Amino acid sequence: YEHSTVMPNVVGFPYKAHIERPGYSPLTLQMQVVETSLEPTLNLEYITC
Amino acid sequence: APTIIDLTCTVATCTHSSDFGGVLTLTYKTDKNGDCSVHSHSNVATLQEATAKVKTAGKVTLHFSTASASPSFVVSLCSARATCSASCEPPKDHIVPY
């Protein structure tokens, strides 16, 4: 059963999602973003000492 | 047989799916606990069971199936009678094997 949602990119924010399939009882998910990491791409140009 | 008076009908959830997709709650008042023969008086809704256990608490639940957006039917418990109406939402599943 496919589903889609949007959750904020804030660490520790206790996001909750609601999914309600008509033939069953609704379900709730707890999502949390424990850590993020934004790694760039590098090309070494030179080195100085 | 036990006697039933002041019988009222409410719907918790409806969904016109192939299976039994609606739950109905009956509130009543009885003198003694026992067995009743529940029925629906319209072919719009088909019940799951034909017999129910009444207890002095006064609440019972039933399951029914229908295929109309707005069902409306008369359900009878033992010798009583009441009117039920509901709103139903489409199911999301496309194909089933029953």
**Interatomic CA distance for residues B43 and B66, integer angstroms:** 9
Relative to beta strand B59-66, strand B39-40 is unpaired
Nearest to B58 by CA among B23, B6, B10: B6
B12 Cβ under 8 Å from any chain A Cβ: no
Q: Do B7 and B82 touch, CB atoms closer than 8 A? A: yes
**Interatomic CA distance for residues B24 and B49, integer angstroms:** 12
A22 Cβ under 8 Å from any chain B Cβ: yes
- Amino acid at position B86, single letter: A
Resolution of the coordinates, Å: 3.7
Sequence-distant (6+) residues with CB within 8 A of B44 are B66, B68, B71, B72, B73
**Interatomic CA distance for residues A12 and A46, integer angstroms:** 40
Closest-CA distance, A14 to chain B, in angstroms, reads: 28
> What kind of experiment solved this structure?
cryo-EM
Extended strands (E) in B15-87: 22-30, 34-36, 39-40, 45-47, 52-54, 59-66, 72-76, 82-85
